């Protein structure tokens, strides 16, 4: 997360870290939507150009109070996966359209103060919350600064990072780039004349974009961090996978 601040303890009990088994390394973010189900981004597992295609044998998922720079053992659960379901119509080729994947844990996890699922939007919840200007929240353990060249200095969060970012109107999203955006994605972030900054960066993808409902006091995952051109560049916005659009595929998979 670029231009974010340290997350308070317990701020995001649905946060999940997708790791590489050996050598261990953070590959992306994820969210916990049930005690067996984990939501993340398809590119985090399958991106053919980079000969990328992980199996449940080369991945692990960490859940709970990690407050990074340590294996929080007691407040953190490491889990193996059972299966991965990558949306059938995922398009790695052009714009990473339908960038969604489901990870089914090997075993149901024991919830706690630090482990707890987030809600999936519903017809009306989406209806009231998804408007331009309304602010969502991104969380991750990725780089604090665009490591294009290398930017090896800093960029290593010892505590989870939060950034609340506004939803940007569709036509602005589209005119910000020469890439084709489908109704399967939305963009979010600050416009140049707004002064504030913030974006997700390398290592944050797959993670949650959530919004709190004033009608019930609940947090709903509205999007998944998918892509953007660079991190926190002026005139550019981060792109998210529209969880509600593909809410139906997530249902067919668990039924």
């Amino acid at each position: 997360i670029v231009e974010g601040q340290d997350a308070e303890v317990g701020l995001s009990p649905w946060q999940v870290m997708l790791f590489r088994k050996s050598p261990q390394e953070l590959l992306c973010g994820a969210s916990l939507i049930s005690d067996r189900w984990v939501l993340t981004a398809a590119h985090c597992l399958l991106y053919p150009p980079w000969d990328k295609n992980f199996t449940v044998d080369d991945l692990l998922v960490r859940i709970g109070k990690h407050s990074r720079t340590r294996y929080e053992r007691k407040v953190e659960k490491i889990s193996m996966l059972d299966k991965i379901y990558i949306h059938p119509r995922y398009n790695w080729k052009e714009n990473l359209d339908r960038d969604i994947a489901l990870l089914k844990l090997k075993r149901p996890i024991e919830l706690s103060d630090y482990i707890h699922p987030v809600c999936l939007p519903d017809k009306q919840t989406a209806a009231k919350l998804l408007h331009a200007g309304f602010k969502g929240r991104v969380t991750g353990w990725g780089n604090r600064r665009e490591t294009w060249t290398t930017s090896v200095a800093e960029v290593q969060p010892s505590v989870l990072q939060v950034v609340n970012l506004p939803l940007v109107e569709r036509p602005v999203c589209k005119a910000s780039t020469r890439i084709r955006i489908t109704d399967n994605m939305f963009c979010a972030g600050y416009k140049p004349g707004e002064g504030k900054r913030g974006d997700a960066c390398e290592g944050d993808s797959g993670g949650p974009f959530v919004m709190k409902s004033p009608y019930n006091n609940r947090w709903y995952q509205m999007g998944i961090v998918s892509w953007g051109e660079g991190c926190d560049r002026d005139g550019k916005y981060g792109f998210y996978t529209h969880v509600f659009r593909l809410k139906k595929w997530i249902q067919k998979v668990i039924d």
Binding site: L120, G133, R137, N217
Partner: peptide
């Protein structure tokens, strides 16, 4: 599912996090 999105350390405790009001403000704006 069910009791989703209510955090054990905030919602369940009637405690609002540090950056929460910023989101609400964006709503009623």
């Amino acid at each position: 599912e069910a009791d989703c999105g209510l955090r054990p350390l905030f919602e369940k405790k009637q405690v609002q996090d540090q950056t929460e009001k910023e989101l609400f403000e964006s709503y009623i704006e």
